A paper describes a structure:
Here we demonstrate that CEP85 is essential for faithful centriole duplication through a direct interaction with the previously uncharacterised N-terminal domain of STIL, a key factor involved in the early steps of centriole formation. Subsequently, through its C-terminal PB3, PLK4 interacts with STIL and phosphorylates it, enabling STIL to recruit SASS6 to the site of procentriole assembly.
Additional sidechain–sidechain hydrogen bonds and salt bridges act to further stabilize the dimer interface. As with the STIL NTD, we calculated the sequence conservation of the CEP85 coiled-coil (cc4) and mapped it onto its structure. This analysis showed the presence of a striking conservation on the outside of the coiled-coil towards its C-terminal end (within the dashed box) suggesting that this region might be involved in mediating protein–protein interactions. NMR and native, as well as cross-linking mass-spectrometry data support the notion of a direct interaction between the STIL NTD and the CEP85 cc4 domain. Further biophysical characterisations of the individual proteins in solution suggest that the STIL NTD is monomeric, while the CEP85 cc4 is in a monomer-dimer equilibrium at room temperature and at the concentrations and buffer conditions used in these biophysical studies while becoming predominantly dimeric at reduced temperatures. While we extend the spectrum of CEP85 activities by showing that its fourth coiled-coil domain interacts with STIL and thereby also plays a role in centriole duplication, the complexities of CEP85’s architecture suggest that it might have additional functions in vivo.
Residue numbers in the entry:
A (entry chain B), B (entry chain A): 569 to 656
Write the structure that this text describes.
């Protein structure tokens, strides 16, 4: 059979392969933490832009209503002028 | 000093402790891959909402433009009636 010294030499190869795998996993953890942080910045930026555009939506809807009031005003004035024209 | 069998046993304790740390790193990586996936899912969902919000904004800008031109035309038609009613 193999001597214990030979088995030790083979086991040290396993120890070194474990360390290399652990190095790769530690690097992957760091990269993933960075990806999470970057994606959180993206999501927060999207939420802030959504707030600004929701405010723009609000302002446009009210603008439509304001222009509808002006429309009614001008229509009523036009009818008043039309009635004056029936006495001209 | 220590026999090769005993040195093997000491090295095997290192193999086992490195395996524990490697398994813990793999679990951390899995948790971080879930965290990345959920944050990218959040960002994409916000982009979906943004696309529908921009559609609403575009439709409202169109309505504002249409109502504005209609009101400007009514203002011109009112001035025309006023000119027809002039006596001097």
């Amino acid at each position: 059979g193999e001597s214990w010294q030979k088995r030790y030499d083979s086991l040290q190869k396993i120890v070194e392969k474990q360390q290399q795998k652990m190095d790769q996993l530690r690097s992957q953890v760091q990269s993933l933490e960075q990806e999470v942080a970057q994606e959180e910045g993206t999501s927060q930026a999207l939420r802030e832009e959504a707030q600004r555009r929701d405010s723009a939506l609000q302002q446009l809807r009210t603008a439509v209503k304001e222009l509808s009031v002006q429309n009614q005003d001008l229509i009523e004035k036009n009818l008043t002028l039309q009635e004056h024209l029936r006495q001209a």
